[PDB]
């Protein structure tokens, strides 16, 4: 349903458009890309926090679990990003540009999982 769905979509969109800009773009333009995805992530997390109290208390812990995973993913992304910033040598750059993409997408997939967890909790209200 919308609020949460809309912000999950915004995060996926952000991941797609950061992934599009990786290949062409230098390093000097890698933190900004990740910064944007991170800001899109924070908005989604705050949106889920606002939705938690209206869901059965027995679903909280799991929702939190899905929330923490995304933070871990963002950490893994920034981690790969550091490597692509430092090593501009082509062979190393192509490799780390690739690991950033893969890590960014892992985030989009867990964002979707968080969504599935919210819907599951909403259905528990039946």
Swiss-Prot record:
Subcellular location: Cell junction, Focal adhesion; Cell membrane; Cytoplasm, Perinuclear region; Cytoplasm, Cell cortex
Cysteines engaged in disulfide bonds, as pairs: none
Post-translational modification: Phosphorylated on tyrosine residues upon activation, e.g. upon integrin signaling. Sumoylated; this enhances autophosphorylation.
Residues carrying Phosphotyrosine: 5
Region described as Interaction with ARHGEF28: spans on this chain: 1-126
Phenotype of gene-disrupted mutants: Embryonically lethal. Embryos die at about 8.5 dpc, despite normal implantation. Embryos do not develop a normal head fold, neural tube or heart tube. Endothelial-specific gene disruption is lethal at about 11 dpc, due to defects in embryonic angiogenesis.
Signal peptide: none
Function statement: Non-receptor protein-tyrosine kinase that plays an essential role in regulating cell migration, adhesion, spreading, reorganization of the actin cytoskeleton, formation and disassembly of focal adhesions and cell protrusions, cell cycle progression, cell proliferation and apoptosis. Required for early embryonic development and placenta development. Required for embryonic angiogenesis, normal cardiomyocyte migration and proliferation, and normal heart development.
Domain writeup: The first Pro-rich domain interacts with the SH3 domain of CAS family members, such as BCAR1 and NEDD9.
Family to which the UniProt record says this protein belongs: Belongs to the protein kinase superfamily. Tyr protein kinase family. FAK subfamily.
Record text on subunit structure and interactions: Interacts with GIT1. Component of a complex that contains at least FER, CTTN and PTK2/FAK1. Interacts with BMX. Interacts with STEAP4. Interacts with ZFYVE21. Interacts with ESR1. Interacts with FGR, FLT4 and RET. Interacts with EPHA2 in resting cells; activation of EPHA2 recruits PTPN11, leading to dephosphorylation of PTK2/FAK1 and dissociation of the complex. Interacts with EPHA1 (kinase activity-dependent). Interacts with MISP. Interacts with PIAS1. Interacts with ARHGAP26 and SHC1. Interacts with RB1CC1; this inhibits PTK2/FAK1 activity and activation of downstream signaling pathways.
Protein name: Focal adhesion kinase 1
Organism of origin: Mus musculus (Mouse)
Encoding gene per record: Ptk2
Residues of the full protein shown: 921 to 1046 of 1052
């Amino acid at each position: 349903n919308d609020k949460v769905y809309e912000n999950v979509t915004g995060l996926v969109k952000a991941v797609i458009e950061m992934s599009s800009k990786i290949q062409p773009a230098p390093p000097e333009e890698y933190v900004p890309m990740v910064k944007e995805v991170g800001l899109a992530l924070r908005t989604l997390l705050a949106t889920v926090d606002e939705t938690i109290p209206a869901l059965p208390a027995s679903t909280h812990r799991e929702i939190e679990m899905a929330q923490k995973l995304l933070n871990s993913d963002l950490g893994e992304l920034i981690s790969k990003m550091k490597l692509a910033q430092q090593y501009v040598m082509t062979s190393l750059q192509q490799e780390y540009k690739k690991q950033m993409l893969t890590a960014a997408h892992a985030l989009a997939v867990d964002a979707k999982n968080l969504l599935d967890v919210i819907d599951q909790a909403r259905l528990k209200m039946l």
